[PDB]
DNA sequence: CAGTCCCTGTTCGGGCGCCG
DNA sequence: GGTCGGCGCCCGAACAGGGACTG
């Protein structure tokens, strides 16, 4: 009996058209029961070849749960109605969020099926089901209420999100929420013991309005991977020309840094392994360029208009560095990643762990998700990537191959 | 006109566009009367209805002959109209492959008869499906009519039906879950685990729920006994294989007669393991005209007569076993070249097949198994839905190597090696650290963007120098150019120091193949050396010998 | 400095095969 | 014959975008 919020594509643009991908049995089978009982609930309802529309689905379990979930690749359709969820319902950044001691999410995309989609639009939420060896031909579908993962379902639900916060915001003014995609980023200073307890109190207050998860993060422990140079008492020929092609690297960042003198070290065409002394000079254009690696970048500040992206390096033995800018060079946040799963045996689980790290902490300090210049050859990518994919956002992305050149972000 | 029993698919033309006027081409005698033959039988059946001049529209329309019969079909060259017809997402996402079959206890097969006419077209777009019947007089007006059903060459008619017979068959399918029944357009494989008794009943149970909604199921086209024909292969109750296949023997080959064989090779290896189109579709590149006759090539000969030996022999694949692991094994064919073959029991192949894309400029075998293994598993979560265990002939030691210590992510499945000759190994290792006594090479090389000339040559730590004045250059052949010239000089262990990330980054990607021959002649004198360090420095910040050789080689 | 060019990788247009 | 849709492969030609040098 809700009246439904009309809905436009930006102007000029025919909606998402993208081909289904082949999914595996374990998948298939997932979402068979999760459509057929969503048709049950009325959620959604088969639909035929006059639309023209498609758009990717597949199925993920979180960390550490049991059941399957569904994923709509939305992606192309988010970016054909990006008009709608900032300009007209748009949802402020609190910028306290990165800085309390603890944040937990929460998966909230259920109480999305509460409320009906435009009927004019349900025509380009469609999607294909695929079945294993083209037993049939696609079973297809499209939403009937808000869909899981659509950027215009959090700002057509924000004015009821609001009035279901008003009585928990009131009790506890301290505490911040922060809403993006289906996901609830809440984060307080309590100790960690009534943090969780004050979550439960939310997790009822949620559950007596028509709605569970659980994943904790520590934003004030986050670091950051600064460039290092080695502290060597013996250098050889090699060593300082590392050290040059390193610091010739990082001077496009830091534009203070100087080489002369530590090249004309390197004067004679010496053998690699030869030991050099350092000059007076030298060791004193080795002690500057130190401390301004310690000094921040001048003239770097985040953009809202801008467009947040992330590039990422293996550096081997289960190290991942990573940096964050808008402008090059003008890196707004950098770090590295260790010991995560699948390390020393699978690259690309490595790979999808740090994606949603990195977008993770993309949201909770500015509120958008970067794209992703993946170092990983396309085919390999859209191959593995599913099978180790535990988020309900996903990130854009493109495919670069740059050899390593000097190691500046990994010693 | 009555009502078919079947619902219609709404559709429309895309906006702000109008039908088609187009006239008719001229007929032979022979198909205007096969025309008004069928013409006037649609007709009769309720399947097209005349037309007055409110119709302002018009298509083209013949007549082809139907394959071992004296029957014609008809078929509309709607060519203008599927341009101002809305588009349509089409649902056959694939094609069955008996590989991915079960064994069942009870098989049927059966093909429901003219299937396209016994489902209806929507009503307002028949107004648009409007052609004329030229007589054998020129000057007779001609018979126009409208169809009612999907017309054969329409480009919804497809996509309409498969979703209409869907729908009709999710009742069967939802009160007799068991049955399996692959519906690939108008072709039904029904297979069940119920007593041969309790499965010729619900054969009929469906013959009759498909005879509810004007879909005939002629006992002609029903298969009851084994083999069963069924997507061109041959069905038995243990194993299937392919329908015979035939290739020309033309004593002058043309560019499409080598298409026709190409593309009935390729259709063979689905199943005939080691068939090769490497030397036949070298034929293929560079060539303009179908019409051009091309001679065979002593290599394309032999790969020609190895096919033809493979073919005579026949071979078979199996089912799919649930229980049992699915597995799959490759093999380095050729250069360039890579085999493979699935199954679940040894040498009972489920299905085989060949990968050889040459993809970049500069690869190696590790890169080109490494693109196999996600071709076939690709291929495999498509036909069955699971990744296989994987045979590969390189050690576990060299990938170790290979993956760890390259710069992108890569990775593969579960595997295990198998020893089967040509293993699958990297050429040539670059050092991590300088190696100590080893002679020190300061290369560089550069040219002239107009003259085309340029100079590359060395400096060593032990007073070595080479400069060799090149023509026809670029700046990058001549950085690569320097780099071969310290090899060659150079002793079984050898350090170099250059400035181009160019050529770094061919290198350290540990190639052993290369469009470029300058690239392979550099691969064979990395593989001579014991140990190669390469490294970098930044260019004109008078670096070591790197400043003594950057002005040498200048010009 | 923007503007080429040298290089490399991707995408797509066009042939056959197969199925209905 | 010169109809449609699906899927595969092979090729070249067009697109595209990053690195080094010069106008």
Not at chain 2, 359 to 370: P, S, W
Request: hydrophobic share 35%; net charge positive; with cysteine.
């Amino acid at each position: 009996p809700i009246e439904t919020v009309p809905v436009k594509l930006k102007p000029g643009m025919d909606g998402p058209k993208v081909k289904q991908w082949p999914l595996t049995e374990e998948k298939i089978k997932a979402l068979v029961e999760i459509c057929t009982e969503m048709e049950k609930e009325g959620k959604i309802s088969k639909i035929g070849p006059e639309n023209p529309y498609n758009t990717p689905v597949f199925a993920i379990k979180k960390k550490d749960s049991t059941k399957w979930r569904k994923l709509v690749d939305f992606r192309e359709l988010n970016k054909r109605t990006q008009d709608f969820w900032e300009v007209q319902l748009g949802i402020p950044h609190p910028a306290g969020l990165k800085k309390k001691k603890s944040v937990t999410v929460l998966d909230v995309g259920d109480a999305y099926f509460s409320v009906p989609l435009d009927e004019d639009f349900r025509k380009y939420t469609a999607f294909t089901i695929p079945s294993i060896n083209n037993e049939t031909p696609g079973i297809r579908y499209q939403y009937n209420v808000l869909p899981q993962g659509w950027k215009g379902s959090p700002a057509i639900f924000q004015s009821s999100m609001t009035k279901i916060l008003e009585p928990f915001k009131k009790q506890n003014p301290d505490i911040v929420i922060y809403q993006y995609m289906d996901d609830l980023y809440v984060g307080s200073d309590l100790e960690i013991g009534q943090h969780r307890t004050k979550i439960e109190e939310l997790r009822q207050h949620l559950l007596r309005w028509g709605l569970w998860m659980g994943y904790e993060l520590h934003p004030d422990k986050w670091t950051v991977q600064p460039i290092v140079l080695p502290e060597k008492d013996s250098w050889t020929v090699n060593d300082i020309q590392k050290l040059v092609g390193k610091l010739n690297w990082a001077s496009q960042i830091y534009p203070g840094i100087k080489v002369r003198q530590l090249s004309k070290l390197l004067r004679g065409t010496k053998a690699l392994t030869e030991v050099i002394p350092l000059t007076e000079e030298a060791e004193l254009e080795l002690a500057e360029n130190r401390e301004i690696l310690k000094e921040p970048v001048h003239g770097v500040y985040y953009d809202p208009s801008k467009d947040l992206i992330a590039e990422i390096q293996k550096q081997g033995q289960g190290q991942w560095t990573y940096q964050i800018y808008q402008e090059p060079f003008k890196n707004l946040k950098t770090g590295k990643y260790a010991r995560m799963r699948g390390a020393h045996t699978n690259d690309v689980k490595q790979l999808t762990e740090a994606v949603q790290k990195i977008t993770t902490e993309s949201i909770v300090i500015w509120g958008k998700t970067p794209k992703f210049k993946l170092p990983i050859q396309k085919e390999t990518w859209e191959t593995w990537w599913t099978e180790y994919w535990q988020a309900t956002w996903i990130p854009e992305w493109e495919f670069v191959n740059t050899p390593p050149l000097v190691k500046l972000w990994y010693q | 006109v009555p009502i078919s029993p079947i619902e219609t698919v709404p559709v429309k033309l895309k906006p702000g566009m109008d039908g088609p006027k187009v006239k008719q081409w001229p007929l032979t005698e022979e198909k205007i009367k096969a025309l008004v033959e069928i013409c006037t039988e649609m007709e009769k059946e309720g399947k097209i209805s005349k037309i007055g001049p409110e119709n302002p529209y018009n298509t083209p329309v013949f007549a082809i002959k139907k394959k071992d019969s004296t029957k014609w079909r008809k078929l509309v060259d709607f060519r203008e109209l599927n341009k101002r017809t809305q588009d349509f997402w089409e649902v056959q996402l694939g094609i069955p492959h008996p590989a991915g079959l079960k064994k069942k206890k009870s098989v049927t097969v059966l093909d429901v008869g003219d299937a396209y006419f016994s489902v209806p077209l929507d009503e307002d777009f028949r107004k648009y499906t409007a052609f004329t019947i030229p007589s054998i007089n020129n000057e007779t007006p001609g018979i126009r009519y409208q169809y009612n059903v999907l017309p054969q060459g329409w480009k919804g008619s497809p996509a309409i039906f498969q979703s209409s017979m869907t729908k009709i068959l999710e009742p069967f399918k939802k009160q007799n879950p068991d049955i399996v029944i692959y519906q690939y357009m108008d072709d039904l494989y029904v297979g069940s685990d119920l007593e041969i008794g309790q499965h010729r009943t619900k054969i009929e149970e469906l013959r009759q729920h498909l005879l509810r909604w004007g879909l005939t199921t002629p006992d002609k086209k029903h298969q009851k006994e084994p083999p069963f024909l069924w997507m061109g292969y041959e069905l038995h109750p243990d194993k299937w294989t392919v329908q015979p296949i035939v290739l020309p023997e033309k004593d002058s080959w043309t560019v499409n007669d080598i298409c026709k064989l190409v593309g009935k090779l390729n259709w063979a290896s689905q199943i005939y393991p080691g068939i090769k189109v490497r030397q036949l579709s070298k034929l293929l590149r560079g060539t303009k005209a179908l019409t051009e006759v091309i001679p065979l090539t002593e290599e394309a000969e032999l790969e020609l007569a190895e096919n033809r030996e493979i073919l005579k022999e026949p071979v078979h694949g199996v089912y799919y076993d649930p229980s049992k692991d699915l597995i799959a094994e490759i093999q380095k064919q050729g250069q360039g070249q890579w085999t493979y073959q699935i199954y679940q029991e040894p040498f009972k192949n489920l299905k085989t097949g060949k990968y050889a894309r040459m993809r970049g400029a500069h690869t190696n075998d590790v890169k080109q198994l490494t693109e196999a293994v996600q071709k076939i598993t690709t291929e495999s979560i498509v036909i069955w839905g699971k990744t296989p265990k994987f045979k590969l002939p390189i050690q576990k030691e060299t990938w170790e190597t290979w993956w760890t210590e390259y710069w992108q992510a890569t990775w593969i499945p579960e595997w295990e090696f198998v020893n089967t000759p040509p293993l699958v190994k990297l050429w040539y290792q670059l050092e991590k650290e300088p190696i100590v006594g080893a002679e020190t090479f300061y290369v560089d090389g550069a040219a002239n963007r107009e003259t085309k000339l340029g100079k590359a040559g060395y400096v060593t730590n032990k007073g070595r120098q080479k400069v060799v004045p090149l023509t026809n250059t670029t700046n990058q052949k001549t950085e690569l150019q320097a780099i071969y010239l310290a090899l060659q000089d150079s002793g079984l262990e050898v350090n170099i120091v250059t400035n181009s990330q160019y050529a770094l980054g061919i290198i350290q990607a540990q190639p052993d193949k290369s469009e470029s021959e300058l690239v392979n002649q550099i691969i064979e004198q990395l593989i001579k050396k014991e140990k190669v360090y390469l490294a970098w420095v930044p260019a004109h910040k008078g670096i070591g010998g790197n400043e003594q050789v950057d002005k040498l080689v200048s010009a």
